[PDB]
Amino acid sequence: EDPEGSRITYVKGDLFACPKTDSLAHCISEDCRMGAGIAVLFKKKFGGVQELLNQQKKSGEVAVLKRDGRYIYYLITKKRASHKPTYENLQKSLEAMKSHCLKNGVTDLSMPRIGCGLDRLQWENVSAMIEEVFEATDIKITVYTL
């Protein structure tokens, strides 16, 4: 009797108070503008705007910063901040993140309800997508809501 446990755990609280060893993820546009929502706090806490731009990542890719021995993943899901993401680009970006996690030994991720709220995707779809992308890995995801 060897319980895998849930892929996704839900926590009411502050994403940025997650374990310091967890990597973090959220969604941004190719323009790397982080002027609304939780992105504002990613910008304040981790910076990296020019470093991210220099990676020249496109929709469906992931830009990455290393901060304090773990990673901050910038899922590039749309071209511009005022646009809306497709599920297809979100999936591609998550796959990209997964492959980086696996290459770099990341086993624990924390994130908000990615794509949802202002990006106007439906959480039931995103959670299913996360489950599909991370199946057959031992990467656990904690999703934070204030």
Annotated binding-site residue? 115: yes
Annotated binding-site residue? 5: no
Report which of 18, 15, 36, 39 is spatially closest to residue 27, judged by C-alpha positions.
39
Extents of the domains making up the chain: 7-146
d(CA 114, CA 75): 9
Please count the residues of the chain: 146
Annotated binding-site residue? 68: no
Q: Which residues are catalytically annotated?
A: 78, 119
Report which of 74, 88, 94 is spatially closest to residue 141, judged by C-alpha positions.
94
- Resolution (angstroms) stands at 1.4
Report which of 56, 54, 29, 55 is spatially closest to residue 42, judged by C-alpha positions.
29
Residues 6+ apart with CB under 8 A from 115: 27, 77, 85, 90, 121, 126
Annotated binding-site residue? 146: yes
Fold of the domain spanning 7-146? Leucine Aminopeptidase, subunit E; domain 1 (3.40.220)
